[PDB]
Design a binder for these strands. Structure first.
Length: 293
DNA sequence: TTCCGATAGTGGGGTCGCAAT
DNA sequence: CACTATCGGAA
């Protein structure tokens, strides 16, 4: 009945890959948190802001799954509030409750939602707290592409980050859902743009002592000591109409080679990339390389 | 054989903790 | 977060 590890989402690129009917909810741009005795982050480390942990641990039933978010605040402000080990904290904050694991993890998503609906009926006060606004996310039924697109337009106008899609009978998988599985899909709209390469930085292999983590995955520290330079491009620094930042994902092995081999000739060339607008502070959020020219 | 799931690993922006300054 | 490279087992 314990949540071995949080359910993660797969990315939807081709809307035709969606299996209908499906259950959708708005995507919250916040910080993940599951109640396992106390409030835990996505990596199962306790939530630093003891006041939030305490308040949520009390209001929510063991096995709750959701995201913490500050209404009207920037993403970074929400991050500061959640990641800071505040002694005392009085500001208002919300918690979007989107899943609930009771006894069996293999219970169908629709049923787990029913559990949420039932629990809320029995404890009305948990949505009335004066400091913590607990917002339940009951999925909406979408039967086709026309409906999904309409729903998307709707949640985006209301300020959400995007839309999350669930297979009705999907189990609560311990780990990341795949596309074929369709258990949990995220749907975000990225914006394409172009920028000029101004420099290149070499790729660095991390040879720090490989350990284990809260789940049993390979964990390696990032001490600059264990970082050994390789003869391939690690990231490029670009100039997006005055804004300077780096793009390091979206390259395959051959490209990292080609880029480093011709580091001289590529400086000054225009690259196409994409990024997510919402949440961007001083430069593009989630920059991903697409191509050249 | 080919495809797909599970991992390890490489990168980005940005904030907090905390020892050193 | 976004993404690539592998490996071993499912299809």
């Amino acid at each position: 009945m314990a949540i071995t590890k949080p359910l993660l989402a797969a990315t939807l690129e081709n809307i035709e890959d969606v299996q209908f009917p499906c259950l959708a909810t708005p995507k919250i741009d916040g910080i993940r948190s599951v109640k396992q005795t106390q409030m835990l982050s996505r990596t199962f480390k306790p939530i630093r802001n003891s006041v939030m942990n305490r308040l949520l641990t009390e209001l929510l039933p063991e096995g709750s799954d959701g995201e913490i978010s500050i209404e009207g605040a920037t993403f970074q402000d929400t991050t500061s509030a959640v990641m800071t080990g505040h002694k005392m904290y009085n500001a208002k904050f919300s918690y979007y409750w989107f899943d609930y694991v009771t006894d069996d993890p293999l219970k169908k998503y629709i049923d787990r939602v029913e559990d949420m609906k039932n629990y809320i009926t029995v404890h009305p006060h948990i949505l009335e707290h004066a400091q913590v606004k607990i917002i339940p996310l009951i999925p909406v039924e979408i039967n086709n592409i026309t409906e999904l697109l309409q729903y998307e337009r709707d949640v985006l106008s209301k300020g959400f980050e995007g839309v999350m899609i669930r297979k009705p009978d999907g189990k609560y998988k311990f780990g990341r859902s795949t596309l074929k599985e369709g258990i949990l899909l995220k749907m975000k709209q990225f914006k394409d743009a172009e920028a000029t390469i101004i420099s290149m930085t070499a790729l660095f292999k991390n040879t720090n002592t490989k350990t284990k983590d809260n789940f049993g995955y390979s964990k390696r520290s990032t001490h600059k000591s264990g970082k050994v330079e390789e003869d391939v491009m690690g990231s490029i620094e670009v100039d997006y109409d005055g804004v300077v930042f780096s793009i390091g994902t979206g390259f395959d092995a051959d490209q990292r080679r080609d880029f480093w081999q011709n580091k001289e000739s590529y400086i000054g060339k225009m690259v196409k990339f994409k990024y997510f607008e919402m949440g961007s502070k001083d430069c593009p959020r989630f920059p991903v390389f697409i191509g050249i020219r």
